[PDB]
Design a protein around this ligand. Structure first.
Ligand SMILES: CC(=O)O[C@H](C(=O)O)c1ccccc1Cl
Ligand SMILES: CC(=O)O[C@H](C(=O)O)c1ccccc1Cl
Ligand SMILES: CC(=O)O[C@H](C(=O)O)c1ccccc1Cl
Ligand SMILES: CC(=O)O[C@H](C(=O)O)c1ccccc1Cl
Ligand SMILES: CC(=O)O[C@H](C(=O)O)c1ccccc1Cl
Ligand SMILES: CC(=O)O[C@H](C(=O)O)c1ccccc1Cl
Lengths: 319, 319
């Protein structure tokens, strides 16, 4: 478990995982793997106060798409808004597993989150979910009044493959010429369908997210090699010209995460393309510390969450 | 100038420095070198609003020590407080060169800064300044009412050698058993009188702070090898037992800073000793981005400053 330099509570978490192992996640059926995350997130008392949650089903992408709209409690008027794309490696995850993370971003930013219930993998494959994600984002931009938001002040946010999804939705919005986006919040994003970065090599196991999981996640998403080479799957492969004009980004990475290097590399490519980027590595931390309910009271995690909420707020102001 | 991955405005700054060079800083007299920083900081329009500045001379350390007390404007009552220790490699720096940085921390935190006017080097040598710094911190703890602060809610903060000073004052407070400190804010701290870390090797020149400057700074501070080995000069040399019980820390480092590795290493040692630490590397950034007035409008720099102010605020609340 862990490494020299892992933050103390995080290291204890890793050791607890190592104890009483269980089968590797990637050896489970999608149903059983989904239940592992559900059970783990439900195992910890967490503050979910300060929010008003309501479901809305929309017609877009030529289908019905379910949204969970999460609004700061006791606030009147149209509020700015961020789309929220959940992580879980495409196979896992949903709204309640991610509700604490979403709640923290909403309460900290004062903005409304719109969770999009994209179709999981392998039930669907690329590009089904990203097309749903984009469709919902366009819908919010043009129909925001219906759910109490100002669709002209619109960001995208997500963790892990949700960070992939947020980045790709920003690219799709550029491709489509609409909608205008204020900001992209990328928390430990997946950015490349390749597994040879220094961080992938160093943290292959023992640090929660493993290389084995990442390959399984990608395989469930799509085994089409040409699909994986597209910028809408692996945005790290985009040229400077393709990245030009994307909205300002905050990218948080974790020191002990296989995805650390590709996230920081994507931030560099955005910067080289003239996009405004803040790229921050949280040392001592593991992958997706912001999702994990058992880590939500770690002081560094709280600091990272204060930052994520504040930066959403900064970019969602009037004028 | 610079490297692949340097944030765009920062890279332009580095290129401007390279153009129209001038003599290396470390070849100048202390007087002339001091004027270089003064002139550069004065070259940029910056917001200094929202603060009330007043000088106070105190009797401590068996001498007179000048303080600049920087209070949020239009606020009544006793406020919590952080000591502020300026950087400049011991040779350079003062209050006005650092006033924008201090102002940003005050306005963002809502807490009062107490700048300590320690004796520069080589006019004095180790341990004169750190003894003054500690003496002033103890004074504020016990006499805070006189300058409108709650001395029981007291943090230490500083940039570069000021980060060294803040860390060392926390160690001296532990050694003395007083005063109680809420928090240490270390912005790109100097932590070791050695020059062989990977970051020292990689960024030896071309990134504002050079290895040559750092060696000159240390030489002016003290050439006593035994002094440099003391934990009050090089706190990285402290054992876990020596670090045990120190106050919670936020350490910000910069990706392209010779001091990056020793700062992150000190954060690791604090964590190993059970101290609460948040260690954050701002990618794309150079050394002491928070001091430099020409960089104060870079978005990543603004985000880092919002974080520094917020974390001071978090740790200076009642109860
Ligand atoms: C990677 C794994 O095996 O799942 C963990 C477990 O409960 O074992 C786990 C632990 C805490 C939070 C989430 C998850 Cl998913
Ligand atoms: C790459 C991805 O999306 O990461 C997931 C995440 O942490 O969100 C994840 C990774 C490992 C175990 C559980 C979960 Cl849920
Ligand atoms: C778990 C947690 O609350 O850590 C806090 C935070 O960073 O929010 C914190 C808040 C106030 C004082 C100390 C500390 Cl450590
Ligand atoms: C390191 C050096 O030579 O000083 C710089 C210069 O003006 O050349 C400089 C530039 C901007 C801000 C401060 C300073 Cl000190
Ligand atoms: C090590 C130190 O204290 O760094 C100074 C700082 O950036 O504060 C500094 C470094 C290079 C040039 C000017 C100045 Cl002022
Ligand atoms: C120079 C600067 O203000 O950048 C800002 C910041 O991060 O504070 C900012 C604020 C609102 C919207 C965009 C941007 Cl980029």
């Amino acid at each position: 478990s862990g490494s020299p330099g892992v933050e103390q509570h995080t290291q204890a978490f890793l050791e607890a995982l190592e104890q009483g192992g269980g089968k590797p996640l990637e050896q489970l059926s999608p149903k059983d793997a989904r239940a592992v995350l559900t059970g783990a997130q439900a195992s910890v008392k967490v503050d979910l106060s300060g929010i008003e949650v309501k479901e809305r089903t929309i017609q877009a992408n030529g289908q019905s798409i379910k949204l969970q709209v999460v609004r700061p409690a006791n606030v009147k008027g149209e509020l700015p808004v961020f789309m929220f794309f959940h992580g879980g490696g495409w196979v896992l995850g949903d709204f309640p597993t991610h509700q604490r993370l979403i709640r923290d971003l909403v309460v900290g930013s004062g903005a409304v989150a719109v969770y999009v219930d994209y179709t999981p993998s392998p039930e669907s494959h690329y590009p089904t979910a990203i097309n749903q994600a984009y469709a919902a984002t366009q819908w919010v931009a043009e129909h925001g009044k219906e759910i109490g938001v100002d669709g002209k002040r619109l960001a995208v946010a997500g963790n892990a493959v949700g960070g992939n999804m947020a980045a790709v939705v920003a690219l799709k919005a550029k491709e489509a010429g609409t909608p205008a986006l204020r900001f992209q919040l990328l928390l430990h994003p997946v950015t490349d369908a390749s597994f040879e970065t220094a961080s992938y090599k160093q943290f292959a196991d023992g640090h929660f997210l493993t290389t084995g999981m990442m390959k399984w996640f990608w395989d469930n998403y799509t085994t089409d090699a040409k699909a994986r080479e597209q910028i809408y799957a692996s945005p790290l492969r985009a040229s400077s010209e393709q990245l030009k004009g994307l909205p300002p980004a905050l990218v948080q990475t974790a020191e002990f995460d296989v995805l650390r290097d590709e996230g920081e590399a994507y931030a560099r490519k955005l910067n080289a393309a003239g996009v405004t980027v803040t790229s921050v590595r949280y040392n001592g931390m593991i992958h997706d510390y912001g999702l994990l309910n058992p880590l939500s009271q770690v002081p560094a995690v709280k600091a990272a969450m204060r930052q994520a909420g504040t930066e959403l707020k900064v970019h969602l102001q009037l004028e």
